[PDB]
Amino acid sequence: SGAIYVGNYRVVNRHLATHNDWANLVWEDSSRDLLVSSTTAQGCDTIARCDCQTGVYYCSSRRKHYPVSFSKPSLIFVEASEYYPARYQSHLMLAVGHSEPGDCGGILRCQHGVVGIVSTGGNGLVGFADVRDLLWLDE
Ligand SMILES: CSc1ccc2scnc2c1NC(=O)N1CCC[C@H](C(N)=O)C1
Numbered sequence: 097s098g099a100i101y102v103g104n105y106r107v108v109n110r111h112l113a114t115h116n117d118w119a120n121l122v123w124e125d126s127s128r129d130l131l132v133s134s135t136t137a138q139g140c141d142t143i144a145r146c147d148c149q150t151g152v153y154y155c156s157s158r159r160k161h162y163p164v165s166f167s168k169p170s171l172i173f174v175e176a177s178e179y180y181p182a183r184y185q186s187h188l189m190l191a192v193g194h195s196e197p198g199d200c201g202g203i204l205r206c207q208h209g210v211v212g213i214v215s216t217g218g219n220g221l222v223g224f225a226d227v228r229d230l231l232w233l234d235e
């Protein structure tokens with residue numbers, strides 16, 4: 097679990113969005129596993145606007161942060177789950193690092209700010225949904 101709170105927006109994994117997220121919907125994209133809902137309170141986070149390919153992510157299944165080198169956002173095949181049929185997920189970045197399903201929502205940060213959130217993983221891999229292209233989150 098986990099979310100990004102920036103301005104009057106809450107960014108979550110689409111497959112973990114709550115009834116309240118859907119009732120306050122701003123934007124969602126199944127191909128990215130992202131949903132953004134509106135909030136009444138002002139957020140705590142800021143978004144990176146950069147091309148970093150290294151950073152640090154929070155891994156809830158270890159209660160620890162780990163450094164990672166990750167690929168540029170791209171279209172990657174993701175096998176079927178209870179949440180989605182087998183499909184290509186867009187704007188996904190992969191890295192070598194521990195993850196388990198409950199780790200979705202952990203933040204990836206570089207020195208500039210929030211880069212994205214854990215969205216996929218397995219076998220010593222962890223995948224992050226990028227948010228750096230969503231310029232409207234702070235504009
Ligand atoms: C951190 S998630 C994770 C991690 C390890 C393992 S081992 C086996 N399944 C996983 C796993 N789950 C995972 O990749 N998906 C289930 C939730 C929706 C995801 C998506 N964006 O389509 C795909």
Ligand SMILES: [Zn+2]
Pocket residue numbers: 144145146147148206207208209
């Ligand atoms: Zn950066």
